[PDB]
Design an enzyme around this catalytic site. Structure first.
Site: not given
Ligand code: HEM
Ligand SMILES: *[C@@H]1O[C@H](CO)[C@@H](O[C@@H]2O[C@H](CO)[C@@H](O)[C@H](O)[C@H]2NC(C)=O)[C@H](O)[C@H]1NC(C)=O
Ligand SMILES: *[C@@H]1O[C@H](CO)[C@@H](O)[C@H](O)[C@H]1NC(C)=O
Ligand SMILES: *[C@@H]1O[C@H](CO)[C@@H](O)[C@H](O)[C@H]1NC(C)=O
Ligand SMILES: [Ca+2]
Length: 595
Positions: A110, A186, A108, A258, A188, A105, A190, A184, A351
């Protein structure tokens, strides 16, 4: 070409081109086409989108409009007949820790996010969807099938809003509707740092030259950092406990809180950036603010690429690992780094790896307190149980010592997500993650199951019998043909997930292919992959090759006993060694001495 390039993208993006650090937005990775791999562009289409009108409208939107001469079943019905199950005994994965679920998760998040459309700022269209269940525009409600216990208790539907798309926002086509990827492509970090400049600094601590990330001031964890609170009320984390008054967190990614265990990992990660910056400074005191944050940020993305690619994927892909992702052969400019519209559904295999309960473990990894085990559904947008229930270290222990759920053809997704999902702005613990996923395949225009089997050079069942042999299940096959009426119509999410697992991995052949190729492309299309020669010093790479999710716990919590292989299933205290026995990220090779 429908349009060779379309509107709605930030024009003011330009490239240094010899800088050592990635942009926040993903822009400037590729020299030949700069926009490739960047946030806020469209998800790639590995195959032409398939819509009811051929443009933007979803299958199952116009009742009389069949797909291949058959009505597509309602998402909730597929959910009720195939996805659901009652008995949680015997579903845990004997050889996959709860961390195995959580990391998927995290990875994913990122790589991809396709958010719901806007214009609902003050929309009773948002509400009209909620209250009268009227299908129109971007409001694509999920209707309950007759014989559904939600008819009795919840109303006629579950709200659902079509995803965002490029160029015209509300509402226009062509070219055939193409959805947005807000992060992004990549790998990385994010999700720690944001994918917009506006967020990224909003999140840095610029009140000082140390390059640290902005932390919480209103709460602490034995003197350890917590992610800042997001001060955007209406906030759902406040909404779950009106009393507790605890908002969600601010992270580079919007979904941080979440559930408590995703929020947790984010915590470990922020701590890692700060933790590292202090060190860069200690060895390199001259280095400015930016220099510290940029370089820590670079260490961090590299840590995620290593755990993901060295530890995580081999155990997800199994035998299928080399067939798709052969040993790294350097940066390739021709490789399309973009996440495809279908990967975002393929990665949703996670999931069926989510269990119905979360645990807190004490120092002896034993139920910590009276209520250590809690249902998953009381943990959506729950931050108050971290700050006010004694801290993260015990949730981290849960992660090591509990087991992921095994996907199971007769037991696919837990009711916690299947009947009890909390979604922000909608009020109840009453939503269905499976139905959402299916409604979304249709929203995003995904090609059916057989198209994707075709794409992956796999057989294409046309009969009940056909499908039986592929899935290796007579009853599943039959339920699926009773609703779909042909495999050409089976939504990929279900199609792919129905396949028995390949050897030593956690997905079927269809997905190992869908997953395998995507990840390969993001490793091969990254001008900044860590193992790319020229990006780190040889020395620096021999120092990262040692990092471990075990190490990440040691350096950033008060846990002093950890497994060596965090993702396999590990029982305490046999499989547990002291942190002292674990390899450290030697930052010594980052010394930059002017004289
Ligand atoms: C308890 C943990 C989880 C919860 C509560 C959760 C819930 C959700 C929700 C609400 C969505 C948005 C669905 C939609 O509106 O279309 C979503 C999407 C998604 N989920 Fe999860 N999920 C969890 C775990 C995971 C895991 C373990 C994985 C993979 C290993 C995963 C992969 C994804 C992906 C790729 C998306 C689509 C994101 C995008 O738009 O690019 N999720 N999930
Ligand atoms: C809302 O949060 C409060 C805590 O912030 C929860 O109350 C705690 O629960 C038990 C007693 O019921 C105690 O062990 C804690 O010390 C309580 N604290 C306070 C301030 O009451 C409460 O359970 C939460 N409510 C919901 C619905 O989740
Ligand atoms: C920023 O860093 C300074 C120096 O360590 C610290 O005192 C302060 O708490 C940090 N501020 C925020 C908002 O994180
Ligand atoms: C680069 O990627 C392209 C796209 O597949 C391909 O020509 C080749 O396999 C790769 N090889 C090299 C040496 O760049
Ligand atoms: Ca990214």
């Amino acid at each position: 070409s429908w349009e060779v390039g379309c509107g709605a993208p930030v024009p003011l993006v330009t490239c240094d081109e010899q800088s050592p650090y990635r942009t926040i937005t993903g822009d400037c990775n590729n020299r030949r086409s700069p926009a490739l791999g960047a946030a806020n562009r469209a998800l790639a289409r590995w195959l032409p989108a398939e819509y009811e009108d051929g443009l933007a409208v979803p299958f199952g939107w116009t009742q009389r409009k069949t797909r291949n001469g058959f009505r597509v079943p309602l998402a909730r019905e597929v959910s009720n007949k195939i996805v659901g199950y009652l008995d949680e005994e015997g579903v845990l994965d004997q050889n996959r820790s709860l961390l195995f679920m959580q990391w998927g998760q995290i990875v994913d998040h990122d790589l991809d996010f396709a958010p719901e459309t806007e214009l609902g700022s003050s929309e009773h269209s948002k509400v009209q969807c909620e209250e009268y269940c009227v299908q129109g525009d971007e409001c694509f409600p999920i209707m309950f099938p007759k014989n559904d216990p939600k008819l009795k208790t919840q109303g006629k539907c579950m709200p659902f809003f079509r995803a965002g798309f490029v160029c015209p926002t509300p509402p226009y086509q062509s070219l055939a509707r193409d959805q947005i990827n807000a992060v992004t492509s990549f790998l990385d970090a994010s999700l720690v740092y944001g994918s917009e400049p506006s967020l990224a600094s909003r999140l840095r601590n610029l009140s000082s030259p140390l390059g640290l990330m902005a932390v919480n001031q209103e709460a602490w964890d034995h003197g350890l950092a917590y992610p800042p609170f997001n001060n955007v009320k209406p906030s759902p984390c406040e909404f779950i406990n009106t009393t507790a008054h605890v908002p969600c967190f601010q992270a580079g990614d919007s979904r941080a809180s979440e559930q408590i265990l995703l929020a947790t990992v984010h915590t470990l990660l922020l701590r890692e950036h700060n933790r590292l910056a202090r060190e860069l400074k200690r060895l390199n005191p001259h280095w400015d603010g930016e220099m510290l944050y940029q370089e820590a940020r670079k260490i961090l993305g590299a840590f995620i690429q290593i755990i993901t690619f060295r530890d995580y994927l081999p155990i997800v892909l199994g035998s299928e690992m080399q067939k798709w992702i052969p040993p790294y052969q350097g940066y390739n400019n021709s490789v399309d780094p973009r996440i495809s519209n279908v990967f975002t559904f393929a990665f949703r295999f996670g999931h069926m790896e989510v269990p119905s309960t979360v645990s807190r473990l004490d120092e002896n990894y034993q139920p910590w307190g009276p209520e250590a085990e809690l249902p998953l559904h009381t943990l959506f947008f729950n931050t108050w149980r971290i700050i006010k229930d004694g801290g993260i270290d015990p949730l981290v222990r849960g992660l090591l010592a509990k087991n992921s759920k095994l996907m199971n053809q007769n037991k696919m997704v837990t009711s916690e997500l299947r009947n009890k999902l909390f979604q922000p702005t909608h009020k109840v613990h009453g939503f269905d993650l499976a139905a959402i996923n299916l409604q979304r395949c249709r929203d995003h225009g995904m090609p059916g199951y057989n198209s994707w089997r075709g794409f992956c050079g796999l057989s294409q069942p046309k009969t009940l019998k056909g499908l039986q042999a592929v899935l290796k299940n007579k009853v599943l096959a039959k339920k699926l043909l009773d609703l779909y009426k042909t495999p050409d119509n089976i939504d990929i999410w279900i199609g792919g997930n129905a396949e028995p697992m390949v050897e030593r991995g956690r997905v079927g052949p269809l997905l190992a292919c869908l997953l395998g190729r995507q990840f390969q492309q993001i490793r091969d299309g990254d001008r900044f992959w860590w193992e790319n020669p020229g990006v780190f010093t040889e020395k620096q790479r021999d120092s990262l090759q040692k990092v471990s999710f075990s190490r990440l716990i040691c350096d950033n919590t008060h846990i002093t006993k950890v497994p060596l292989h965090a993702f396999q299933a590990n029982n305490y205290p046999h499989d547990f060694v002291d942190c002292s026995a674990v390899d450290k990220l030697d930052l010594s090779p980052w010394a930059s001495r002017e004289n």
